[PDB]
Design a protein around this ligand. Structure first.
Ligand SMILES: NC(=O)c1ccc[n+]([C@@H]2O[C@H](COP(=O)([O-])OP(=O)(O)OC[C@H]3O[C@@H](n4cnc5c(N)ncnc54)[C@H](O)[C@@H]3O)[C@@H](O)[C@H]2O)c1
Ligand SMILES: NC(=O)c1ccc[n+]([C@@H]2O[C@H](COP(=O)([O-])OP(=O)(O)OC[C@H]3O[C@@H](n4cnc5c(N)ncnc54)[C@H](O)[C@@H]3O)[C@@H](O)[C@H]2O)c1
Ligand SMILES: NC(=O)c1ccc[n+]([C@@H]2O[C@H](COP(=O)([O-])OP(=O)(O)OC[C@H]3O[C@@H](n4cnc5c(N)ncnc54)[C@H](O)[C@@H]3O)[C@@H](O)[C@H]2O)c1
Ligand SMILES: NC(=O)c1ccc[n+]([C@@H]2O[C@H](COP(=O)([O-])OP(=O)(O)OC[C@H]3O[C@@H](n4cnc5c(N)ncnc54)[C@H](O)[C@@H]3O)[C@@H](O)[C@H]2O)c1
Ligand SMILES: NC(=O)c1ccc[n+]([C@@H]2O[C@H](COP(=O)([O-])OP(=O)(O)OC[C@H]3O[C@@H](n4cnc5c(N)ncnc54)[C@H](O)[C@@H]3O)[C@@H](O)[C@H]2O)c1
Ligand SMILES: NC(=O)c1ccc[n+]([C@@H]2O[C@H](COP(=O)([O-])OP(=O)(O)OC[C@H]3O[C@@H](n4cnc5c(N)ncnc54)[C@H](O)[C@@H]3O)[C@@H](O)[C@H]2O)c1
Ligand SMILES: O=C(O)/C=C/C(=O)O
Ligand SMILES: O=C(O)/C=C/C(=O)O
Ligand SMILES: O=C(O)/C=C/C(=O)O
Ligand SMILES: O=C([O-])C(O)C(=O)[O-]
Ligand SMILES: O=C([O-])C(O)C(=O)[O-]
Ligand SMILES: O=C([O-])C(O)C(=O)[O-]
Ligand SMILES: [Mg+2]
Ligand SMILES: [Mg+2]
Ligand SMILES: [Mg+2]
Lengths: 552, 553, 553
């Protein structure tokens, strides 16, 4: 450290609080600025857990926890490590959605970097104002699709912040390497345009060429300063923007879209867990999507990929996937629009065309339904019953976030199918106990299981581009951790409590893959990939700040 | 002008404006992108705070929130306090500060002052040199032995100096960067705190050896060696034995007063003088009974004596009108319970019947004014109050013990049980009391917050070197002289807390006029307009421009 | 963009522009008033420097002045060097750097690199972490045992790494903030320096135990642990024993070369190849006699062998054409004086008469080329030169020892005593020589300054991990291929120092083309235009704008 005195306490990266040793206090001029008491991290973690028990509302817990990030960074990640299953719903979905919805009302300090359309031509100067020099990972949003909550504008910054908290908490990616970015080009959210506390420009979303040119400039500005292999994770962008940006940049920059590719990886891993229980033939698979956007087309393309990898044709796989959007079932000649990514999953109309999603369950008789509409409880009791009628063990994935936007609950799923269904949710549900005393612990089909492990590997390997097949390996490495006990309880994913261990093992496997496929440019290639990744994880343990005094 | 730019301007609460950093400021000082594109006014920030607060329940949750602002955006903190000081005084000051000190270590996020332990001994100078501010003018110091009526809280007592200096700035516009809260940690005799794993002081019993005196000496020297021999040092919540002997040892050697003796003396008297204006009771017929013979008791009594002496009476026949009743019973000549030097002048020949209870002391001595400063709970019982309503047409009842739980009685039971005839003041805030007959009594708060800001400002601006007991007499006069007829007519013996800013400045003005008149001011030259002089040197909560001066040649 | 403003921008020579700080820059960055109202161009600053210099006498006074600039205004320093590198090369480099190192401690004002002593042992990491620059790409390191021909100068030798890295930037446009000069102090065997009170190293004799190897190891690890395993480490002036065993121990384990072996090998060869172009002497008839069998001797010999081997000859019959004559006399099989591993291939069966002097070795062996690398003075005597002019129509005479005093002979006495028939190169600079018959010979300087910049730039930009002897062979080819006919026609066996910038960049370009072709480059992606790639990444001496980006919304 180059600074001494009070600045060590005002900088949350360095502030240890009362856990500054007596030597550190004397040698760095902190003596008297701290109480005479000298604490351990274990005492601070305890103080935190005592105060958290007295708190009632999840938002109040979010303001407290996220407050600690701006006061004592080490302690922030220590309390996250202490019980991440407990705190995931608070720092992440669903509470982060509540946080974003009124970000401007709970604001205390900015977090991450803000690039506005008014800053077009000057984005380098902005990027140059970020104090950290060795940034390896960027999570960026323009706030247009923040979960199922729609266009929240600059309020969307809460999502990148949450994502990069989990980079560190799960994978042990260095916080000071992490850069959360919000692109502000306006918002079409009229409620926010008359909110006097809104933190963005008071304008409707700029959709001219200035938009595309701004994202170009942001991409050039980031890599110019930090490195051409700088990982840029796109999050909660609008459908149209999500896709064309992913394709326009995936060959030019080290990028991926968490909502398309990250979701695809966690969904499949869930379906591969389900298929290990069911053990049905790969020919008797009809997958029906509620929603035909980022998450739908993403998951679909990666299913096809593992089906092609595991037996049948590419054209055989696409006829097995069906999609029902806002306008009706995706069928050739339908009056409503079809984009180029929806083409492979749009089919010639069947005998009768469904009006509602329940009619589509009965007509198509699918073995698995997946909900990514962000449109609320559309896996109605009838849809769930009909799905349990048609299948001995139906697969119901209600992945939409947050909880209110979810297609159905864990209880609704396990009850109406009499404990037959294999269930995963995007937002976390607790264990379900049915009338006959059977306990079902639902798994969370959320891209939190992927993006950390993937990100760490891509960084540590100095990888330049991320193919769809990297998300296949993560999908395989996630399910390859699920034990027989955990699946006997109905979990299609390992427990959220072990997501650290899971994300590390995923990074190791994705590391091995990237090296074996000439995608790693970190010379020299390490022998023990396990020990390589494990000895490079950031730790929440306080470091020594004492200068090296010695001998002569 | 600022010496630093970039992220450090936001990490420093002295300089952080949040989204009130102008576009130009963001671009020139390298903040562009580090803040949301939104540019805000303090008015918008202020409004964000109030909507958040309306909306919390527990007073302690409000304390953690408001005091949090002081470590994020200092300007906004004081703007918040200024917007509605009466609302927030209960939260930042008595009683909620007591609740906060009682678990200071359970709610700790950042330190908020200078900590000088008994281990830090012979090295106090280097610790004072670790304080980042160069021009400190005002120290409030405690050892935590007498935090309100909550007794020995040790380092947990730091909450009190912090609160006091927030009010230096909020009431008198004394500059925060010139303010230094200090906690002297010599251990605590509070066994509950020694068993608490979150305690912030040394895990040891209160050191009462020579080393305690040697440490306070070294502190007084270290502070004045760095910041100046006329650096204001306010002693707060030190506990009877130490408060007095330190006041006397240092009052002529440094620029130092004890707030719990002299401050509370001045506000009590100002309350008694406001009471005199409605009663007009002949001076000879006055009789004051104190519940307690401690710091506040003896402080208030010495300023009453001085006021009586100034108005005709002699020292001896003024002291004869003051009785005191401590934990061992009434104070009379040759009792089993001890009588210290300061208590002797008020220890009189035993009456006919020596009372065992305080109610007996009322019915015997038949006092006109009753002052409670015991910190021992609800000792002004309904029967104590009734007896006062019987003996006196207009009984004066000052229940000054803090916090609210330790007060001798409420406003409710004072105004009720005297049939709205009493003249009442509390130490801790009470709301207006409506009696069955429809009359609405608004109780005034006899708390030293009405004194220490104005006096402190005057002393600082006048470069005063030593504070006489006579300054506090002038403070009391200055304070009561601002009480309007209409406010005295609703039962207020003090101006409302809502106006404590202008009251505090007016006190400061009057005290500077006095300090100059009596050749106690050492600021050259003497200004012509003392009102204009004080008013133009008050710190403002309005954001300063941080823009470099850019101009054409 | 800069992180700091105010006086610190002037106290840091990396950022100080002096009066070239624009009005806007002064006002926004808080420099207004700290600088004279005058605003200047680098052209005016440059002009101020040259008028001051024209006008000093002693070379050492010029060295103290120019090297002073590097610690005041770095941009201006390199601008100065760039304006006229040929003029100032004698002052900042050989020979005046030798004079400077010989009394480095008498002229000391500021330190100019990283000092790692044998006392600093097991703690080398913390010392490397004290260097304020985060992105070091190029280290030049010495232990001071072999500073030029001046031998063991200890810490006084630090002058040499400083000089080398100034030329990294001046010649190859390698970024100064990425450059780290290092001095390893393990004591000195120089008794004169141990008696000097101004000596800058430990007052102890050169430690030659295991701890010396353990320290160099720890240095190699500490540097690469912080800055990267492919961090270029140039070994300079280490002394025969250590130079070779460290080169071999580390050449395949780190990105490291020895400049006094491999650099001087490449420039010597480039000189010999330029000589071949005018003589066209059949390969079989070549015979090279070295005065010295040290670092430079063995380095140059190994690159000659490789060039001959590439052009048809075998290893054995190439080595048979190289003879060496050290301090003990000629090197032949089974002599009293020792023969180390690296010397064996060149140690041949004794001729008819074993010479006692070097002149005898010429008259016996009748060599076509004579190379002096003894650092032992004027050993190429008039009779040595005459004998060469007799034996050879066009004798090749390379007097490469540095500095000027230690050179084997001058240009004057080479061109004179061979009647302007010799092909000559010096290690230290000589002016043009006009003979009585009117012909004017311009001597070229066979000095490794022509190699280490270009090679270093290539290695850095190509992210090369290990340097093969073959890279230096390509450097030699690249260097001589820039020698024009007109320059070779005035007696230059090297391009002029005036053009060393573009020569150094062209070397770098050619070496990058080679490193990529032979899969030694690890910078992804491979660029299409290698010339454009190198040229667009050179550091420029032109001031950068330090203005915050201010713009309207
Ligand atoms: N669990 C996870 O890890 C994860 C990851 C990414 C996205 N999601 C969630 O998926 C949901 C949508 O994500 P997206 O990025 O695909 O959004 P999107 O805009 O790309 O896609 C929405 C799709 O759903 C359709 N739809 C909307 N309302 C409908 C209705 N009532 N009936 C039928 N179809 C309807 C739309 O027409 C569109 O095709 C959100 O709730 C989001 O938070 C979850
Ligand atoms: N309103 C104000 O401005 C203000 C200022 C200072 C102190 N106070 C309050 O006054 C109280 C005491 O302050 P202090 O510094 O004088 O304390 P202190 O320690 O100096 O003395 C307390 C006195 O009360 C007596 N006492 C204790 N218990 C008693 C009982 N049951 N019956 C009768 N007497 C009893 C003690 O013997 C002693 O004489 C505290 O609650 C404090 O918060 C209020
Ligand atoms: N137009 C105006 O508003 C106006 C006019 C004249 C002076 N001033 C102010 O007065 C100051 C001049 O200082 P000076 O050195 O001549 O001493 P001074 O004579 O003005 O003040 C006397 C002492 O009180 C201190 N002091 C003044 N204001 C204070 C505050 N708000 N909080 C704490 N301490 C305070 C000073 O540091 C000094 O030690 C300037 O900072 C200036 O802002 C303002
Ligand atoms: N970032 C810079 O500009 C900079 C400056 C000085 C030195 N260095 C580097 O320091 C290196 C020493 O270790 P290393 O980085 O090579 O280890 P490494 O090569 O094993 O690390 C591989 C990559 O992942 C990054 N990385 C390692 N641990 C990480 C973590 N916990 N979170 C996020 N990213 C992580 C590294 O920065 C590197 O880019 C040198 O190789 C040198 O190149 C970098
Ligand atoms: N021009 C250049 O680029 C360049 C590069 C490196 C070294 N040099 C110079 O070459 C000289 C030696 O360098 P080195 O590293 O090879 O030194 P070294 O210590 O490796 O060896 C010097 C050699 O010269 C021999 N020698 C010494 N005195 C002699 C004498 N009187 N007669 C014959 N031989 C004698 C020694 O025995 C030894 O073989 C130094 O002056 C040095 O400055 C020049
Ligand atoms: N138009 C232009 O002039 C232009 C175009 C492209 C890049 N650049 C420059 O190239 C750099 C990009 O760096 P990168 O991280 O992509 O590595 P890189 O691939 O450009 O360079 C390869 C290695 O050489 C180093 N390097 C480059 N120039 C150097 C110098 N002058 N001195 C010392 N070391 C040097 C780098 O740090 C890196 O380790 C930028 O700093 C930029 O100024 C300039
Ligand atoms: O409204 C603000 O800018 C800051 C609020 C806070 O720090 O609480
Ligand atoms: O206990 C600490 O040191 C910090 C606590 C917090 O920031 O809340
Ligand atoms: O500045 C100088 O000239 C010398 C400094 C020193 O000897 O330390
Ligand atoms: O953050 C998430 O959980 C996911 O990316 C989503 O958009 O629903
Ligand atoms: O702080 C106070 O309100 C007072 O000084 C007391 O001690 O009660
Ligand atoms: O520095 C030089 O010129 C050369 O490396 C030498 O050692 O003579
Ligand atoms: Mg998302
Ligand atoms: Mg008090
Ligand atoms: Mg050398």
């Amino acid at each position: 450290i180059k600074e001494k005195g009070k600045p060590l306490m005002l900088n949350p990266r360095t502030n240890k609080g009362m856990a500054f040793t007596l030597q550190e206090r004397q040698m760095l001029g902190l003596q008297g600025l701290l109480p005479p008491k000298i604490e351990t991290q274990d005492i601070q973690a305890l103080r935190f857990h005592r105060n958290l028990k007295k708190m009632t509302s999840p938002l109040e817990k979010y303001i407290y926890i996220m407050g600690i990030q701006e006061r004592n960074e080490k302690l922030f990640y220590r309390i996250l490590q202490d019980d991440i299953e407990s705190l995931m719903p608070i720092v992440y979905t669903p509470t982060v959605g509540l946080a974003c919805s009124q970000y401007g009302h709970i604001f205390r300090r900015p977090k991450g970097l803000f690039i506005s359309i008014s800053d077009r031509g000057h984005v380098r100067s902005i990027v140059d104002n970020w104090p950290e020099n060795h940034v390896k990972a960027v999570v960026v949003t323009d706030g247009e699709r923040i979960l199922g909550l729609g266009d929240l504008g600059v309020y969307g910054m809460g999502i990148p912040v949450g994502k990069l908290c989990l980079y560190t908490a799960c994978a042990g990616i260095r916080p000071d390497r992490c850069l959360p970015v919000c692109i502000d080009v306006g918002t079409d959210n009229i409620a926010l345009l008359k909110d006097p506390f809104y933190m963005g420009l008071y304008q409707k979303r700029d959709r001219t060429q200035q938009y595309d040119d701004l994202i170009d400039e942001f991409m050039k500005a980031i890599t110019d300063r930090y490195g051409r292999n700088t990982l840029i994770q796109f999050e909660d962008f609008g459908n149209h923007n999500a896709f064309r940006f992913l394709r326009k940049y995936r060959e030019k920059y080290c990028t991926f879209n968490d909502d398309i590719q990250g979701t695809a990886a966690v969904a499949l891993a869930g379906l591969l867990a389900a298929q290990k229980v069911i053990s049905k033939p790969i020919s008797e698979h009809k997958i029906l999507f509620l929603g035909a956007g980022e998450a739908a087309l993403g998951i679909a393309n990666l299913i096809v990929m593992s089906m092609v990898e595991n037996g049948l044709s590419e054209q055989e796989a696409q006829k097995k996937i069906w999609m029902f959007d806002k306008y009706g079932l995706l069928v050739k000649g339908r009056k409503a629009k079809i984009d180029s990514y929806q083409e492979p999953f749009t089919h010639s109309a069947p005998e009768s065309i469904p009006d509602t999603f329940e009619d589509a369950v009965n007509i198509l008789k699918p073995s698995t339904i997946i909900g990514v509409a962000g449109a609320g409880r559309l896996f109605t009791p009838d849809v769930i019953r009909a799905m349990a009628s048609i299948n001995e063990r139906p697969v119901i994935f209600a992945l939409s976030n947050p909880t209110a936007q979810a297609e159905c609950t864990a209880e609704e799923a396990y009850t109406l199918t009499e404990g037959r269904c294999l269930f995963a949710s995007g937002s976390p549900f607790g264990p379900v106990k049915l009338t006959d005393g059977r306990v079902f612990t639902p798994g969370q089909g959320n891209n939190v299981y992927i993006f950390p492990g993937v990100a760490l590997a891509v960084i540590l390997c100095n990888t330049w581009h991320i193919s769809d097949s990297v998300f296949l390996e993560a999908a395989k490495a996630l399910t390859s951790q699920l034990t027989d006990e955990e699946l006997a309880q109905g979990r299609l994913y390992p427990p959220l409590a072990n997501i650290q261990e899971v994300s590390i093992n995923i990074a190791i496997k994705v590391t091995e893959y990237l090296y074996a496929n000439k995608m790693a440019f970190r010379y020299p290639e390490p022998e023990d990939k396990a020990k390589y990744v494990k000895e490079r994880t950031w730790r929440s343990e306080y470091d020594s700040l004492l200068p090296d005094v010695y001998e002569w």
